[PDB]
Design a protein around this ligand. Structure first.
Ligand code: HEM
Ligand SMILES: *[C@@H]1O[C@H](CO)[C@@H](O[C@@H]2O[C@H](CO)[C@@H](O)[C@H](O)[C@H]2NC(C)=O)[C@H](O)[C@H]1NC(C)=O
Ligand SMILES: *[C@@H]1O[C@H](CO)[C@@H](O)[C@H](O)[C@H]1NC(C)=O
Ligand SMILES: *[C@@H]1O[C@H](CO)[C@@H](O)[C@H](O)[C@H]1NC(C)=O
Ligand SMILES: *[C@@H]1O[C@H](CO)[C@@H](O)[C@H](O)[C@H]1NC(C)=O
Ligand SMILES: [Br-]
Ligand SMILES: [Ca+2]
Length: 595
């Protein structure tokens, strides 16, 4: 009885139970439940789903159906009233670099992706949502409220299609709708290699037998590699500048060209692979095609893990790090490694850390030419600016020398994302990521703010006065009350992001709990966690310690100087040492004397 294990996208994999490398799919990590953490399975439910009809319909779908006796406010009205602001002066994070934001996104992309259903692309039901704004099946449009200026320029709604669900589309009744995670729940560089055997092979250089990833043929970066292009036509990247006609990149993760600094990070990571496949080949000429591909992958997988747990999480989690992510005690095959549905909204705290502009800096960390600083909205699905406007060195310099946006209760999401988002299969720089996030919380059946505060053992405010105390903000609380009427109805994404930050952290208490717990699980439930005995050799492990984001940059770019601590705010030249003092990865401990 009950669900008892459903899923359509599961197929044809035999576990090689003593293999030394991860599957691409994530299958076989947990030997007693081989599908746990595998790509293309339902996101985990830490709490039961909450839908308007119990099974599948999002709160907000039917106008007369309340949540807890009140209508849920339109996602766009929530965005306009609470999330927006005009003035970028004074928003920057004085002790986080931009790389802090961008690493966040890399990590997120390693861990989760819940992709939109295609009900009818090859039909104009997908432009029946766009053009007519008609709710139905997987079309769930974000309707504009009364005084929205997008009414005057953009029509009635922003189109939105519901996330795909397991046992696939579009009929699903008897049990509750569970959304898919299309990437491996393990922190394993699946964003570099793919989470599907088919993609992971297409990405590889299967002409030389040297364990390499395919590089751009068409274009190179002063010799250094670009990712290959996706020859999808239509490329949304071509669309944003048809004169330049430069396509999107092809990577392990389908979202790699969403924004130019994500694309840039992917580039660095690929380079670091193909570089590792070269240096291993000189160190061990006995090694064949896979051997080189798997050993490099395995290294890069570890790098991600170390930077994330050593450098990134302590500065998001601050004083709460210890409470949730104690020192690693070993692989615990009882721990659920799966990504939870709520984590995929919790980790969207990063949307508040993205600033309005991106800079290209030259070799003296100075403005690279006349258009050096660009508005963020010009850089969505923009690969042409990497290629025909300076390569990645100047963007990486910007990444290190510039700052992230600081989360601010009065200045939450820059207008670059809130009014000017570009969606593929849409024409316009006119979408709203905050609104989209709120619609998505509802799409995914998220429990409200107080259920999560309950989950995390935090107080649950019922009153305007209660909320003011929890948020430490009268005005913000009054605005949430006017819109939602009860704190029980507040969507988790806005709720968790409105809380003041923990000391030394960049998230509030509720998010630190949700995030912290999921990352603990990611580590403890991973058999191939880099420091689990026997995944690497002791020799290799003391070498892995050396790794830094600074060294990643020195190797896969023509940059000569970099900070020691790349995630905190760093000012040039005062904080910039040379690539020579950035400790290199010692690759001797992988040298095998084995015919
Ligand atoms: C320029 C920067 C960014 C852009 C343009 C961007 C855009 C997007 C978009 C379009 C989505 C899909 C939203 C949906 O349909 O529900 C998304 C989801 C997401 N964003 Fe971002 N975002 C960026 C930065 C970040 C950062 C810095 C983080 C984390 C630190 C992050 C974490 C995520 C997560 C977790 C998801 C959910 C992924 C999934 O499971 O499907 N985002 N973002
Ligand atoms: C696979 O890697 C090899 C390099 O080892 C690439 O082959 C070279 O490509 C160009 C011709 O376009 C020339 O430099 C040489 O004739 C080739 N080199 C060698 C060593 O034979 C090949 O392009 C790679 N493929 C991908 C997709 O990355
Ligand atoms: C910047 O933040 C880090 C925590 O990552 C801390 O070690 C350092 O003291 C901070 N520096 C300043 C000057 O605030
Ligand atoms: C498109 O790219 C061309 C060639 O790189 C460049 O000269 C131009 O500024 C770009 N135009 C737009 C509208 O983005
Ligand atoms: C995790 O591992 C520990 C030690 O084996 C075990 O006692 C516990 O039940 C497991 N579950 C979790 C993650 O708490
Ligand atoms: Br994205
Ligand atoms: Ca992964």
């Amino acid at each position: 009885s009950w669900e008892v294990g459903c899923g359509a996208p599961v197929p044809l994999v035999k576990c090689d139970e003593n293999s030394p490398y991860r599957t691409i799919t994530g299958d076989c990590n947990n030997r007693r439940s081989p599908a746990l953490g595998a790509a293309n399975r339902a996101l985990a439910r830490w709490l039961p789903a909450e839908y308007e009809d119990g099974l599948a319909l999002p709160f907000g779908w039917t106008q007369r159906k309340t949540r807890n006796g009140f209508r849920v406010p339109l996602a766009r009205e929530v965005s306009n009233k609470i999330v927006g602001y005009l003035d970028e002066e004074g928003v920057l994070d004085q002790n986080r670099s931009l790389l802090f934001m961008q690493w966040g996104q890399i990590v997120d992309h390693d861990l989760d992706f819940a992709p939109e259903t295609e009900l009818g692309s090859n039909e104009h039901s997908k432009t029946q949502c766009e053009e007519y704004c008609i709710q139905g099946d997987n079309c769930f449009p974000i309707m504009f409220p009364k005084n929205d200026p997008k009414l005057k320029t953009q029509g009635k709604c922003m189109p939105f299609f519901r996330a795909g669900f397991v046992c696939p589309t579009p009929p699903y009744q008897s049990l509750a709708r569970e959304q898919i995670n299309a990437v491996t729940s393990f922190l394993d560089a699946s964003l570099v290699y793919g989470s599907e055997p088919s993609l992971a092979s297409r990405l590889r250089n299967l002409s030389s037998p040297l364990g390499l990833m395919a590089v751009n043929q068409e274009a190179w970066d002063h010799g250094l590699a670009y990712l290959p292009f996706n020859n999808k036509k239509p490329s949304p990247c071509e669309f944003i500048n048809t004169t330049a006609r430069v396509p999107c990149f092809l990577a392990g993760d389908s979202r790699a060209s969403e924004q130019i600094l994500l694309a840039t990070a992917h580039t660095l990571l690929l380079r670091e692979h193909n570089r590792l496949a070269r240096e291993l080949k000189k160190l061990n000429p006995h090694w064949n095609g896979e051997k080189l591909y798997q050993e490099a992958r395995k290294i890069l997988g570890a790098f991600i893990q170390i930077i994330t747990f050593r450098d990134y999480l302590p500065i998001v989690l601050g004083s709460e790090m210890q409470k949730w992510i104690p020192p690693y005690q070993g692989y615990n095959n009882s721990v659920d490694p799966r990504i939870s549905n709520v984590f995929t909204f919790a980790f969207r705290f990063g949307h508040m850390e993205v600033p309005s502009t991106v800079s290209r800096l030259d070799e003296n960390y100075q403005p690279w030419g006349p258009e050096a600083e660009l508005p963020l909205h010009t850089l969505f699905f923009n690969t042409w600016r990497i290629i025909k406007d300076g390569g990645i060195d100047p963007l990486v310099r910007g990444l290190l020398a510039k700052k992230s946006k600081l989360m601010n209760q009065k200045k939450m999401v820059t207008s670059e994302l809130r009014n000017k988002l570009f969606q593929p299969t849409h024409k316009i720089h006119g979408f709203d990521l905050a609104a989209i996030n709120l619609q998505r919380c509802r799409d995914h059946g998220m429990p409200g703010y107080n259920s999560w505060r309950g989950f995390c053992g935090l107080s649950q405010p019922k009153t305007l006065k209660g909320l003011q105390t929890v948020l430490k903000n009268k005005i913000l609380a009054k605005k949430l009350m006017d819109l939602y009427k009860t704190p029980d109805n507040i969507d988790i994404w806005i709720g968790g992001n409105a809380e003041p930050m923990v000391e030394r952290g960049r998230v509030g208490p509720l998010l630190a709990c949700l995030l912290g717990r999921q990352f603990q699980q990611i580590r403890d439930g991973d058999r191939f966690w880099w420091e689990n005995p026997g995944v690497f050799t002791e020799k290799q492990r003391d070498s892995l310690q050396k790794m830094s984001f600074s060294r990643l940059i020195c190797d896969n770019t023509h940059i000569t100087k970099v900070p020691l601590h790349a995630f905190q705010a760093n000012n040039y030249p005062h904080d910039f040492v040379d690539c020579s003092t950035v400790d290199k990865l010692d690759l001797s401990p992988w040298a095998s004397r084995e015919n």
